[PDB]
């Protein structure tokens, strides 16, 4: 099975492990994981986080042929489980100094869900992309500006977290994957760049 390929100790996730638009697994509702986690589920989380780390590392991205990425969902590896990894880097200043925190968000999340959200909507100015989508897709992907999420870490510890800005967008994108929702589902059908008054456009 896909899971057995991915959890092999020497196996590194690359683009060849990522399923494509059209594959039915991308449209399922992913199954909840049970705690305590199986070895496979724990290893899979670690491999997904390692993928993100590698995708953001100039050397490893080049070695493995990777598109830079800030999130990954298990359904994108053909694994229909509620497991996502998020790695949102902070940026250096104008002087070249690294940020005080390397990341605004770094987590492998099990059974994540949005438990509440703002009335206000938000969208990235530049639209969104997807590891599983090899098409140019224009338009505002309209999401909640702010969310409160619950999820479990690999230990089974429950977390409750409020998110805004890019972090909120990233987590929503990945949670959609585990609900069988694609980013373009949330782009206006008639005018991709339609702006409903009050939309927060993130630069
Ligand atoms: O498809 C992806 C990769 C997208 C994530 C997001 C796109 C938009 C928000 C998150 C990616 N693009 C750049 N870095 O990662 N994750 O499911
Ligand atoms: Zn592989
Ligand atoms: Zn079930
Ligand atoms: Zn481990
Ligand atoms: Zn590495
Ligand atoms: Zn810190
Ligand atoms: Zn609601
Ligand atoms: Zn995606
Ligand atoms: Zn929602
Ligand atoms: Zn459409």
Curated annotation (Swiss-Prot):
Stored Pfam families: Pep_deformylase
InterPro entries xrefs: Peptide_deformylase, Peptide_deformylase_sf
Reaction catalysis annotation: N-terminal N-formyl-L-methionyl-[peptide] + H2O = N-terminal L-methionyl-[peptide] + formate
GO molecular function, one term: metal ion binding
Annotated Gene3D superfamilies: Peptide deformylase
Binding site for Fe cation: 130, 173, 177
Active site: 174
Known EC number: 3.5.1.88
Top-level EC class as recorded in UniProt: hydrolase
Cofactor remark: Binds 1 Fe(2+) ion.
CDD domains the UniProt entry points to: Pep_deformylase
Domain of life, per lineage: Bacteria
Record carries keyword Hydrolase: yes
GO biological process, one term: co-translational protein modification
Cofactor list: Fe(2+)
Keywords: Hydrolase, Iron, Metal-binding, Protein biosynthesis
UniProt xrefs under PANTHER family: PEPTIDE DEFORMYLASE (PTHR10458), PEPTIDE DEFORMYLASE 2 (PTHR10458:SF8)
Family: Belongs to the polypeptide deformylase family.
Known function: Removes the formyl group from the N-terminal Met of newly synthesized proteins. Requires at least a dipeptide for an efficient rate of reaction. N-terminal L-methionine is a prerequisite for activity but the enzyme has broad specificity at other positions.
Protein name per the record: Peptide deformylase
Naturally occurring in which organism (per UniProt): Streptococcus agalactiae serotype III (strain NEM316)
């Amino acid at each position: 099975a896909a899971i057995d390929k991915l959890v092999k100790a020497s196996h590194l996730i690359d683009m060849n492990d990522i399923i494509r638009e059209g594959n039915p697994t991308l449209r399922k509702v992913a199954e909840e994981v049970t705690f305590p986690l199986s070895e496979k589920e724990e290893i899979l989380g670690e491999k997904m986080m390692q993928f993100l780390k590698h995708s953001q590392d100039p050397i490893m991205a080049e070695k493995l042929g990777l598109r830079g990425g800030v999130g990954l969902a298990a359904p994108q590896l053909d694994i229909s489980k509620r497991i996502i990894a998020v790695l949102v880097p902070n940026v250096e200043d104008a002087q070249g100094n690294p940020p005080k925190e390397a990341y605004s968000l770094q987590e492998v999340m099990y059974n994540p869900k949005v438990v509440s959200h703002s009335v206000q909507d938000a969208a990235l100015s530049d639209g969104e992309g997807c590891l599983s989508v090899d098409r140019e897709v224009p338009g505002y992907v309209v999401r909640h500006a702010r969310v409160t999420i619950e999820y479990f870490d690999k230990t089974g510890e429950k977390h409750r977290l409020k998110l805004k800005g890019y972090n909120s967008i990233v987590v929503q994108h990945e949670i959609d994957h585990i609900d069988g929702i694609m980013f373009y589902d949330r782009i206006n059908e008639k005018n991709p760049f339609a702006v409903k008054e009050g939309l927060l456009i993130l630069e």
